[PDB]
Amino acid sequence: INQLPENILLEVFMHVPARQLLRNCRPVCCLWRDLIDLVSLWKRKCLREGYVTEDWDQPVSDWKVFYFLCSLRRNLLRNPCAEEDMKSWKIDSNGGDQWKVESLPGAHGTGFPDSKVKKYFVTSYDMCLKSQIIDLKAEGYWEELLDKFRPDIVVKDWFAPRADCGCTYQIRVQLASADYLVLASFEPPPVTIHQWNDAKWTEVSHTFSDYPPGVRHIFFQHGGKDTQFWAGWYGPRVTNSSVVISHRVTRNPP
Amino acid sequence: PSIKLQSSDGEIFEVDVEIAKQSVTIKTMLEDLDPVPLPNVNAAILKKVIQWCTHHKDDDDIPVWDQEFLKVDQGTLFELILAANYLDIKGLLDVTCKTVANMIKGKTPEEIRKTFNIKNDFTEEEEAQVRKENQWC
Ligand SMILES: CC(=O)N[C@@H]1[C@@H](O)[C@H](O[C@@H]2O[C@H](CO)[C@@H](O[C@@H]3O[C@H](CO[C@H]4O[C@H](CO)[C@@H](O)[C@H](O)[C@@H]4O)[C@@H](O)[C@H](O[C@H]4O[C@H](CO)[C@@H](O)[C@H](O)[C@@H]4O)[C@@H]3O)[C@H](O)[C@H]2NC(C)=O)[C@@H](CO)O[C@H]1O
């Protein structure tokens, strides 16, 4: 097997899952370890995987990390667009008539600007809040990445009213320590909108940069209620909520 | 509409030229040049090569055909990738290499060293080599 050319040995390593290639293939021998830790392995992994185009044009201080960040990069919020009803959301408050799903654009509502989005969650005449608590390590983001590199964590959500009724939208996104202690908090002022509005969907987004070290969880919560005390679902509607950890770090330890 | 390739040990294989062209290093050989000779390929691997090239004469995962075709013994698999490199059939090289990587999956630093039989190069720096990245995998 080590009968093979150095270039060909590299090409085999390309097709090996990275977590395997590092904790198993590297302690096999020096001949292998030297090649696995070669930057051109990871560059070409990114190349083949599509993370990097040959017009790449933007430096990285580390291609192993950069490769993982790109591979892991994905929305950590499950069921963000109400396609599985209410699965994997925790319902912190369920007031009035319950949290409910509804196809777009719904009564006295407008269409969602992304043609991909079909359904939305909607809230009632008393406080309805739902949430998820993203365990960062379980999703593949290992510790020294979170503390020593701190890749920009980006959070988004979308919300619209009905036209015939006023309501209030609330959202909290927090980065919590291993102890579930809050270390960064996106807590925008709650938004109340009145009755006979344009029912327009609105994106809210905030990027966590240079947050403290020790983030182990991203906690994401939103919901609302109407401001007329109406039976049914005249509270705010939300859909398309995302949390994504990008490849940009604030700290390049080398 | 064919050409004759001749293996390292003399056997002549006649092939259409469109299939044979997939080997870059003999499309180039053909620009220069009665059977073209390939003394780095013995007759056996020469056939498995043209067997695969005819199967992709006109064209993520691995195809099932390419999987049944590659259910060969391990030394044939290695000759096959060396032939793919020699002949510059960039497709055959990736299928065969990807296959070797799938043998690598699931095995320990020792269990890899067994099923391929390389000798342990380190001393106790394996500790320095597992934990270096095993710290987070
Ligand atoms: C918690 C609780 O039980 N609270 C109750 C209240 O619900 C109740 O107040 C009434 O609440 C209902 C909804 O719960 C309201 O009905 C909606 O009204 C709007 C429009 O309202 C006016 O405007 C129209 C002119 O454009 C007129 O046609 C209409 O009659 C009204 O004058 C409608 O847009 C809604 O209907 C839309 O949605 C429904 C589904 O939601 C669809 O079927 C329809 O196609 C339509 O698109 C609602 O019907 C109603 O206005 C409230 N009534 C008042 C008087 O305020 C209240 C009464 O006491 O009691 C609370 O405690």
Curated annotation (Swiss-Prot), chain A:
Q: Which SMART domains match?
A: FBA, FBOX
What are the residue boundaries of the F-box domain, all occurrences included?
1-45
Q: Where is the FBA domain?
A: 66-247
Q: Which PROSITE patterns match?
A: FBA, FBOX
The record's GO CC annotations read: cytoplasm; endoplasmic reticulum quality control compartment; SCF ubiquitin ligase complex
What InterPro entries would the database entry show? F-box-assoc_dom, F-box-like_dom_sf, F-box_dom, F-box_only, Galactose-bd-like_sf
Pathway linked to the protein? Protein modification; protein ubiquitination
Name any Gene Ontology BP term. DNA repair
Give compartment(s).
Cytoplasm
The record lists its disulfide bonds as none
Q: Main location per UniProt?
A: cytoplasm
**What sections of the protein cross the membrane?**
none
Keyword terms: Cytoplasm, DNA damage, DNA repair, Phosphoprotein, Ubl conjugation pathway, Unfolded protein response
Question: Which PANTHER family does the entry mention?
Answer: F-BOX ONLY PROTEIN 6, F-BOX ONLY PROTEIN 6-LIKE PROTEIN
Question: What's this chain's function?
Answer: Substrate-recognition component of some SCF (SKP1-CUL1-F-box protein)-type E3 ubiquitin ligase complexes. Involved in endoplasmic reticulum-associated degradation pathway (ERAD) for misfolded lumenal proteins by recognizing and binding sugar chains on unfolded glycoproteins that are retrotranslocated into the cytosol and promoting their ubiquitination and subsequent degradation. Able to recognize and bind denatured glycoproteins, which are modified with not only high-mannose but also complex-type oligosaccharides. Also recognizes sulfated glycans.
Q: What does the record note on quaternary structure? A: Part of a SCF (SKP1-cullin-F-box) protein ligase complex. Interacts with VCP, CHEK1 and CUL1.
Please report the name of this protein according to its UniProt entry.
Answer: F-box only protein 6
Query: What's the source species for this entry?
Result: Bos taurus (Bovine)
From Swiss-Prot, chain B:
Q: Is the keyword RNA-binding in the record? A: no
Q: Which gene is the coding source of this polypeptide chain?
A: SKP1
Highest taxon listed in the record's lineage? Eukaryota
Report whether Cell cycle shows up as a keyword of the record: no
Post-translational modification summary for this protein: Undergoes autophagy-mediated degradation in the liver in a time-dependent manner.
As stated in the Swiss-Prot or TrEMBL entry, residues carrying the post-translational modification Phosphothreonine are 108
Q: Tell me the SUPFAM superfamilies matching this sequence.
A: POZ domain, Skp1 dimerisation domain-like
Q: What does this protein do?
A: Essential component of the SCF (SKP1-CUL1-F-box protein) ubiquitin ligase complex, which mediates the ubiquitination of proteins involved in cell cycle progression, signal transduction and transcription. In the SCF complex, serves as an adapter that links the F-box protein to CUL1. The functional specificity of the SCF complex depends on the F-box protein as substrate recognition component. SCF(BTRC) and SCF(FBXW11) direct ubiquitination of CTNNB1 and participate in Wnt signaling. SCF(FBXW11) directs ubiquitination of phosphorylated NFKBIA.
Which family does the UniProt entry place this protein in?
Answer: Belongs to the SKP1 family.
Protein name per Swiss-Prot or TrEMBL:
S-phase kinase-associated protein 1
Q: How does it assemble?
A: Interacts with KDM2B, forming heterodimers. The KDM2B-SKP1 heterodimeric complex interacts with the PCGF1-BCORL heterodimeric complex to form a homotetrameric polycomb repression complex 1 (PRC1.1). Component of multiple SCF (SKP1-CUL1-F-box) E3 ubiquitin-protein ligase complexes formed of CUL1, SKP1, RBX1 and a variable F-box domain-containing protein as substrate-specific subunit. Component of the SCF(FBXW11) complex containing FBXW11. Component of the SCF(SKP2) complex containing SKP2, in which it interacts directly with SKP1, SKP2 and RBX1.
Pinpoint the Glycyl lysine isopeptide (Lys-Gly) (interchain with G-Cter in SUMO1) cross-link: 119
BP GO terms, sorted: protein ubiquitination; SCF-dependent proteasomal ubiquitin-dependent protein catabolic process
A Gene Ontology term for the protein's cellular component: Cul7-RING ubiquitin ligase complex
Q: Where is this region: Interaction with the F-box domain of F-box proteins?
A: 81-137
Point out the signal peptide segment. none
Which Gene Ontology terms cover its molecular function?
cullin family protein binding
Q: Which organism is it from?
A: Bos taurus
